[PDB]
């Protein structure tokens, strides 16, 4: 992912101000609610039956943190996304057989969530740069299909 070095740090900047214990869980939780067929990869998670049941589920928040961390790994190494997500790519593609359209959906709900949490500070130039980062994660995760 090629960012104008403005971009590179306008993104680092929003990400330190990210509640690391709560935004993965909201992004993961909105995926399962907005795209309900995604709950199939997560049947081991118990109660997933209403938005409120999904959003307050402890397994969702726990897993949302591990997802967000993988993203944090991504922002750190924007020049090597395919080496960072190679282990994850194999997991999501070869074992879990997740259709890669879903990678893109998650990354865009993460954008709707960052926008939710920062409002007027998540501006078009700021989105624009996150769209490239999140396209890059999805591409890198989908590498085992390419």
């Amino acid at each position: 992912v090629h960012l104008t070095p403005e971009e590179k740090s306008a993104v680092t900047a929003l990400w330190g101000k990210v509640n690391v214990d709560e935004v993965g869980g909201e992004a993961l939780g909105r995926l399962l609610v907005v795209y309900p067929w995604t709950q199939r990869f997560f049947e081991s998670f118990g109660d997933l039956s209403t938005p409120d049941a999904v959003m307050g589920n402890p397994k969702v928040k726990a897993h949302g943190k591990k997802v967000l961390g993988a993203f944090s790994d991504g922002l750190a190494h924007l020049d090597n996304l395919k080496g960072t997500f190679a282990t994850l790519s194999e997991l999501h593609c070869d074992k879990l057989h997740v259709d890669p359209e879903n990678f893109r959906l998650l990354g865009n709900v993460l954008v709707c969530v960052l926008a939710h949490h920062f409002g007027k500070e998540f501006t078009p130039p700021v989105q624009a740069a996150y769209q490239k980062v999140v396209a890059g994660v999805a591409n890198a995760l989908a590498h085992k299909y390419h």
Partner: protein
Amino acid sequence: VLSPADKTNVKAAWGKVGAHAGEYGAEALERMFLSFPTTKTYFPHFDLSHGSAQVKGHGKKVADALTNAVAHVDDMPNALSALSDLHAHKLRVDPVNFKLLSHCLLVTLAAHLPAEFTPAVHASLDKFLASVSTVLTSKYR
């Protein structure tokens, strides 16, 4: 296909747009051009400088159509019949672009109205935006 509870969420949440409609459809457009430069193809002569009056005008037309789509949610094929004419028959817009705009519409609703944008309302808005896109990229007349 939208549920009875989808229509409620959409009607309720979209109704809070009001005077901000042309502001919101304009920002949504700007998010789309910045984030997705490929959409610029369809607007080759637009002025797209940040505050361009062309973009605010068009921003208003886009929002007022959605406001009217909500009013006719069970009758959109016939309600937006001419908008299909434009987008599907004449412009021949690739349906991928409808997803990219719908998403930017959702980012603009979350950044401005966080209290409306619950998970349930998010799902409903997403579905409602997909249903309008199907009408505008379809040919059925």
